[PDB]
Each structure stands twice: as structure tokens, then as C-alpha cells.
From a paper:
B0AT1 (SLC6A19) and SIT1 (SLC6A20) are special members of the SLC6 family that rely on the ancillary protein Angiotensin-converting enzyme 2 (ACE2) or Collectrin for their membrane trafficking.
The cryo-EM structures of the ACE2-B0AT1 complex bound to its native substrates Gln and Met are determined at an overall resolution of 3.2 Å and 3.1 Å, respectively. The local resolution of the transmembrane domain of ACE2-B0AT1 complex in complex with Gln, Met, or ACE2-SIT1 in complex with Pro are 3.6 Å, 3.9 Å, or 3.7 Å, respectively. Neutral amino acids containing hydrophobic side chains and charged side chains might adopt different binding preference in B0AT1. Despite variations in substrate specificity, these three complexes displayed striking structural similarities.
Residue numbers in the entry:
A (entry chain B): 140 to 273
B (entry chain A): 474 to 542
C (entry chain A): 130 to 267
D (entry chain A), F (entry chain C): 612 to 749
E (entry chain B): 342 to 408
G (entry chain C): 130 to 198
The structure:
């Protein structure tokens, strides 16, 4: 949410390396959004056995999230009951706007059918029923 | 000219040193082409010339190669 | 028609003397290329619009004589009609020409390959040993 | 003999213009040749400080096709044997490319030159790193 | 683009409807130059099956569609 | 003797480009002359259905000045006594003006032609007359 | 130096005979204009680079003799 508010969105184009003529190889062989997600935000490593620094630029966001949460629930009821009016209402408007914007794209009504064409050979696996229950 | 320089590369084995568009006429710059003469006589003349030569030493009972007849 | 130097435009060369002897004697790649390309661009360019008309007129002159075109008119010299086995039709000459020429190609390819290998010692760095021969060096 | 100093050009009208695309007749090859000659004139005046009068008859063109792709090379003004080495044509064009693109309304993906690729611009956007400002802001 | 760059066909002649026909013609014309080309085999209703990893949907597809 | 078929041209770089303005050397007069020759070539192929090979040596230029204003007129390809009547040059340019403006990045106020003025476009904006819709809306 | 027709480029005219008598006798505006402009563009263009040098050399030849130019 903070990396918005700029017209050339940071996840729109790749950065250039030291030699400012060719793209970074990680961003070249893949999409720029995958690069901004896996390298500029997370800086993800190669295995679960490779832990690294604490990566300050995530501590600020974590502290902001927890501070806002603590602000809203300072007293349980009588304080969350005043924020719920907006918090549980704004989504049902933004989502209607996004539904109207989505159902008029190119692949709409062509990607929805993939959601509603079941295959009767998948219903007999225990995994699907367990996941449905969970 | 496109066909001219296509056939030259394929039959004769000769390539031009600068490209030539359709405002040229390279064959027309030859004496026989631009003076309306038939050009095939120089082909068939070459083959008759050796048919006669070869069928004439065999009358003279030649011995060795043809070119010493 | 005549051709003249780019440096001293006041000396022009005819073809029968002057432009022939360059192509026949010189060994200078650049002078041969100049003569070759210049004779075609100075005099070939003039003849094209006339040749396009000569073709059209000659074709009518032949079709009005019960021939197909001027080509089939020219091949009329080799034709024989009704003498029992010595007949020879104007359309056979093309088969004979194209069928005798395919037996020469083996010898001409070796003769052509041998000359190429010997020009590469006269104009090195101008002839590739797997290509054709430039037209102005012949 | 001229195919190692040639440059390949590929043009894709119906992509860039989409429609509205003019038709590529010969009066477009004329404009293209004279624009390349202009580029060469500029390169030899702001690099080598000479003054050479290239014309549109010094740009030779070969292998035209429907894809609208061809080959070209450049010679000295009146010296047919003097081919400007390809590496200098690749600099003249790198210099005046933004101006050649305009004469045709193409945009560097529809006027590929096949051997000279675009480079110009680094991402020097943020002096502030807006995100931490938003951070403090809230 | 690869096909029309190979044989130098007109820009507006090769489209989605008559792609296979032009491919067949260009092969049967010059087998050598056609065989050395590289093609991509990919169809609709097959990119929908690209599995999205955990917590990698709201950040990979929605930002890519918003841009 | 040639001043009643001439057209006046006035160019104002530092206005349109503001800065970034290139300098107007002779390699710009060359490009301008060849672009005018291209315009004439097109006019005589889509109106009169002829094919005339105008070159950049058929555009004569007079009275160059610092304001970057000059005069020009056009002659037949190789016939110095044949001046294309001014009223046809005024049509060739009206036709290809949008394309001549681009080669230089000027915009029809910085490339005045002094006798041919721009016209193209009527105001066919509203199909709804938005104001009464807003009226009803509230 | 010589000048020749745009129509039939194979007849060229010198100046002392041929180009003088046109200018001296003809009454055809177009033929006079052709001869006039052509003699200057075909032969005036050659002499300019030489004249620019002749000037410079002659000026030194004079300044070395206690003259101004
Ligand atoms: C035309 O250009 C060629 C270069 O391609 C010039 O040929 C050079 O000539 C000089 C002296 O005549 C030689 O020293 C060079 O070796 C030649 N060049 C090459 C590449 O070998 C030729 O002189 C030019 N012609 C004119 C009239 O200027
Ligand atoms: C050059 O153009 C002029 C026109 O400006 C031509 O002059 C015309 O010549 C014909 C016959 O020679 C006359 O009937 C016309 O009256 C002439 N024009 C004018 C305006 O009087 C001249 O023929 C052209 N030259 C060439 C070689 O084509
Ligand atoms: C950038 O340029 C330098 C030469 O200055 C070169 O050594 C380096 O390989 C280039 N970088 C890339 C990624 O090609
Ligand atoms: C990303 O991680 C690597 C290794 O963990 C580190 O070297 C690099 O500095 C990190 N990125 C930034 C912007 O600090
Ligand atoms: C593509 O080009 C061929 C070449 O002859 C032509 O026959 C065909 O009609 C063209 N395609 C279309 C859709 O016009
Ligand atoms: C191309 O044509 C040849 C000709 O026989 C054929 O054998 C081959 O299978 C074809 N391949 C493709 C990919 O069209």
C-alpha cells in the first residue's frame, strides 16, 4: 500500500544493473512483478536452512500493522464497535467496483467457466474433501 | 534484371559487384542484344564443330587423343 | 556512348578503344570496377526504355505471321517439315539445348573451380573460395 | 562482394500505426535513402570534421521484400569502389536514429536495424523513496 | 512474428485463423529454412492451470492486472 | 524572373522546441529540399497518375536568412526552363504537410508557408449535449 | 569543357563553336536559358575550388613584393 502513490509503479518495470545497458538477469528471465515480490520486498533466500538478517524494511510495516491493531482494540468492545462501521462496510463497495471493472475485460467470461466446470474424477479423492472441510 | 542476376548466379556462377535495380538493362549493353541478332548459333556451332572433327579423323584412321588429329 | 572519369571529367572514353583495353589488360581491382559499373550505368540506363518498346513491337510483327512470339520466330531456322524421320519442330530445340547442357556442367564446374583458386592469388581478400566470381574480373 | 558491409532493415507498419498506415511505394524508399544520407552527412561533420556530400544515389539497396525488409550499404560520393565500413554506418545511425524514426512515424520497435539496439536511459526516478514518507505520514 | 521473420511474408497476411495453412505452405516450400526455426506450443485453457503458490496470488496476478 | 512562382518559408525553432533545438546547418537544407521533392513525387502519382523523378536538385532555394526564412521553387527533372506552376506546389504541400512537419518536429505554427493556411477539423463533439443530462440527473 | 543535351546525351557542345553561336543567333527563350545555365553549372562548378586557391597563392606572391595584395 505504501509503494503506491507514484505513477511509474515500482512493479511495472525492471531495474538496471551496474552497467546501465542491460536488465538484471533475475528480472530478465522472469516477470518484473515476480522480481519486485521475491527480491525487492522479501529478498527471499534459497532454502529454509538459510536464515539471514532481520531486513529492517519489514520491521516498520510489521510495527505499523500491530500499532494500528492495538489502537483499534484498546478496550475491546466500545472501541472496536466504533471502527466496525467503516471496516466491515468499505469492502462491499470496493469489491462491487472491482467486479464491475473485472467483468468487462478480455478474459472475463472466459476464465469464469474454468471455475464452474467440475471433473467427476476429482471428487473421489480424500484430499479435496479434507480441504473443503478445513 | 532480377531474373538476369538470378540466372547468372545459378547457371554461370558469376555474381555482380553492386546491386542493380529495375532502371538498368545489363543484357542490352551487349552488341548482339542491342542490334537484334540471334545468339543461339554460337551454341550449336560449337557442338557441330567437334562432331565434324571427331567423325573425320575416324576416316583418317587416327591413333591417339583427339586434339592431335 | 562514352564514359568519363570522376576526377578529370574532360577525358571521356569510348568502348571499342579505351574501355575495352582497360578490362582486357588492367589488374587493378578498382579501375576494373569503375569501368564495369560505369559502362552499365551510363549507357545501360539509356537503352532500357527503348528495349521495352522494341520487345512489344517485335512481338506483334511475329504474331501477325502465325508464330507465337519473336522467340518462336527465331527458332524457325532449325525447323524441318514432312520429310519422313528428319522432322524437327521449333519446340524441340529448347529440349535439345537444355539436355546437352546438363552434360557439360561437370566439366565446367571443375574449370570454374580451378580459375577461382587462381584468382585468389591475384586479388586476395576479394574472392571467397566457396562463392561465385565477381563479374568484373573475368 | 558487398554483403559483409550491408545492414538489414525491417519495417512493420501495421503494428505501429495499426491502421492509417500509408502504403510503402517507391517514393518511400526515396525518402528513406535520403534520410540515411542526411544521417551520414551529420556524422562526418560532428565527429570527423570533414564535409562530404553524400546523396541519395550513394545508398545502395538490395533484396526488397513484402515484409518490407531490405539491405543497404553506403559508398563515397563519386567513387563506386569505396564502401564506408559498416562500423561507421552503425554510429551515424545510432546518432540520428531518433530523427529517422520521426520522418516515418515509427518507434524503434517497428524500424529495427538488426545489429544496433536501443539503450538510452537509466531509472533515476526517486529522490525521496516515497514509501517511508508515507510511513511517517501515518 | 517468428514465422513472418523467417520467410519474409507480408505483415497483415499471417493471422490466427489461417496460421496453420501458412505454416504448411512455408514448410512444403523450403523444408530446410523452416525446420531450423523454433516454435512455441501453448494454448488457452492451459495457462489457467498455472498453479499460484501460497500468498502469491494477491501480489502476482492482481498487481500484474492493475498495471 | 522566378519570383512569382516562389513560395516563402519561415521557421521558428526556439519557439516550438523551446530548447533542445538543433542548429540549422546546410544538412538541414538538404533534408528540407529532399522532403519537398518527396511531396512533389507523391502529388504526381495520386492525382495526375504520372511518374516523375523529382530530385533534391530540382528544388531551388533563394534568400536564406537568420530568421531561417527563404524562398523556393520547383522545376521539372532535367529541364531548367520548366517551372511547376505555384498553384500545384501549393497542393502537393497541402497534401503532405503533416508528414513534412514530422521530419523536423515542427508543428504548423513554426513551419509557416506564407500562403497556405491550415484548415482541417470541425467541432463535432457532442452527441448528447451533456448539460441537460446533468439537468435531469439532479 | 563541354556541354550536352538532356535529351540526346551523345551530342556535346564546346564553347568556341557551338555554344557561342546559340547565344549569338538564337531567338528561343528556352534554348538560350539552357545554354546559359548549363555552361555555368557544368564548368563554373569545376573552377571554383581552383580559384579559391589561386587567390591565396597570388596574394602571397604580391605581399612578398612589398605590395598590399
Ligand atoms: C576510390 O576509393 C578507393 C578506396 O576504396 C581508393 O583506392 C585507394 O587508392 C589509393 C591510391 O590510389 C591506394 O593507396 C589505396 O590502397 C586504395 N584503397 C584500397 C582499399 O586499396 C581510390 O583512390 C578512390 N578513387 C578516387 C578517384 O578517389
Ligand atoms: C522544357 O520545358 C519547356 C516548358 O517550360 C518546354 O517548352 C515547350 O516546348 C514546346 C515544344 O518544344 C512548346 O510547344 C511549348 O510552348 C514550350 N513551353 C512554353 C511554356 O512555351 C520544353 O520543350 C522542355 N524541354 C524538354 C527537353 O522537354
Ligand atoms: C558493461 O560494460 C563493461 C565495459 O565497460 C563490460 O565489461 C561489462 O561486461 C558490461 N556489462 C554487461 C552486463 O554486459
Ligand atoms: C538482500 O539479501 C542479500 C543477501 O541476504 C543482501 O546481500 C542484500 O543487501 C539484500 N538487499 C538489500 C537491499 O539490502
Ligand atoms: C498471402 O499472400 C499470398 C501470396 O500469393 C496470397 O495468395 C494470399 O491471398 C495472402 N493472404 C491473404 C489473406 O490475402
Ligand atoms: C515438412 O515437409 C516435409 C516434406 O516431406 C515433411 O516430411 C515434414 O514432415 C514436414 N514437417 C513439418 C513440421 O511441417
Amino acid at each position: 500500500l505504501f509503494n503506491s502513490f507514484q505513477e511509474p509503479l515500482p512493479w511495472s518495470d525492471c531495474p538496471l544493473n551496474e552497467n546501465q545497458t542491460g536488465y538484471v538477469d533475475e528480472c530478465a528471465r522472469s516477470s518484473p512483478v515476480d522480481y519486485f515480490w521475491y527480491r525487492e520486498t522479501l529478498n527471499i533466500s534459497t532454502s529454509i536452512s538459510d536464515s539471514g538478517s532481520i531486513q529492517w524494511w519489514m520491521l516498520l510495516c510489521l510495527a505499523c500493522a500491530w500499532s494500528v491493531l492495538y489502537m483499534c482494540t484498546i478496550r475491546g468492545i466500545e472501541t472496536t464497535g466504533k471502527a466496525v462501521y467503516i471496516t466491515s462496510t468499505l469492502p462491499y463497495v470496493v469489491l462491487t467496483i472491482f467486479l464491475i471493472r473485472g467483468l468487462t475485460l478480455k478474459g472475463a467470461t472466459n476464465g469464469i467457466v474454468f471455475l464452474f466446470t467440475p471433473n467427476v474424477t476429482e471428487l473421489a479423492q480424500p484430499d479435496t474433501w479434507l480441504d473443503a472441510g478445513a | 534484371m532480377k531474373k538476369w542476376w538470378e540466372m547468372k548466379r545459378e547457371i554461370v556462377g558469376v555474381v555482380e559487384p553492386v546491386p542493380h535495380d529495375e532502371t538498368y538493362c545489363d543484357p542490352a549493353s551487349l552488341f548482339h542484344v542491342s542490334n537484334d541478332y540471334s545468339f543461339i548459333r554460337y551454341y550449336t556451332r560449337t557442338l557441330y564443330q567437334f562432331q565434324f572433327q571427331e567423325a573425320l579423323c575416324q576416316a583418317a584412321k587416327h591413333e591417339g587423343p583427339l586434339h592431335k588429329c | 556512348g562514352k564514359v568519363c572519369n570522376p576526377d578529370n571529367p574532360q577525358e571521356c572514353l569510348l568502348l571499342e578503344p579505351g574501355l575495352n583495353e582497360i578490362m582486357a589488360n588492367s589488374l587493378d581491382y578498382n579501375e576494373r570496377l569503375w569501368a564495369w559499373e560505369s559502362w552499365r550505368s551510363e549507357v545501360g540506363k539509356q537503352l532500357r526504355p527503348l528495349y521495352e518498346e522494341y520487345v512489344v513491337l517485335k512481338n506483334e510483327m511475329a504474331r501477325a505471321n502465325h508464330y507465337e512470339d519473336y522467340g518462336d520466330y527465331w527458332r524457325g531456322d532449325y525447323e524441318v517439315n514432312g520429310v519422313d524421320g528428319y522432322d524437327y519442330s521449333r519446340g524441340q530445340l529448347i529440349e535439345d539445348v537444355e539436355h546437352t547442357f546438363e552434360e557439360i556442367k561437370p566439366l565446367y564446374e571443375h574449370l570454374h573451380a580451378y580459375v577461382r583458386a587462381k584468382l585468389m592469388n591475384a586479388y586476395p581478400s576479394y574472392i571467397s573460395p566457396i562463392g561465385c566470381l565477381p563479374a568484373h574480373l573475368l | 562482394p558487398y554483403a559483409d558491409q550491408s545492414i538489414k532493415v525491417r519495417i512493420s507498419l501495421k503494428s505501429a500505426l495499426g491502421d492509417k498506415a500509408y502504403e510503402w511505394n517507391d517514393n518511400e524508399m526515396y525518402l528513406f535513402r535520403s534520410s540515411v544520407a542526411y544521417a551520414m552527412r551529420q556524422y562526418f561533420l560532428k565527429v570527423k570534421n570533414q564535409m562530404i556530400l553524400f546523396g541519395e544515389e550513394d545508398v545502395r539497396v538490395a533484396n526488397l521484400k513484402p515484409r518490407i525488409s531490405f539491405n543497404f550499404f553506403v559508398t563515397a560520393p563519386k567513387n563506386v569502389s569505396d564502401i564506408i565500413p559498416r562500423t561507421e554506418v552503425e554510429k551515424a545511425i545510432r546518432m540520428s536514429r531518433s530523427r529517422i524514426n520521426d520522418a516515418f512515424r515509427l518507434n524503434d520497435n517497428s524500424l529495427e536495424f538488426l545489429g544496433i539496439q536501443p539503450t538510452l536511459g537509466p531509472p533515476n526516478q526517486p529522490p525521496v523513496s516515497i514509501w517511508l514518507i508515507v510511513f511517517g505520514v501515518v | 512474428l517468428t514465422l513472418i521473420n523467417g520467410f519474409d511474408l507480408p505483415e497483415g497476411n499471417v493471422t490466427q485463423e489461417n496460421f496453420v495453412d501458412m505454416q504448411q505452405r512455408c514448410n512444403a516450400s523450403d523444408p530446410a529454412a523452416y525446420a531450423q526455426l523454433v516454435f512455441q506450443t501453448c494454448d488457452i485453457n492451459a495457462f489457467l492451470s498455472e498453479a499460484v503458490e501460497g500468498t502469491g496470488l494477491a501480489f502476482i496476478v492482481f498487481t500484474e492486472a492493475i498495471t
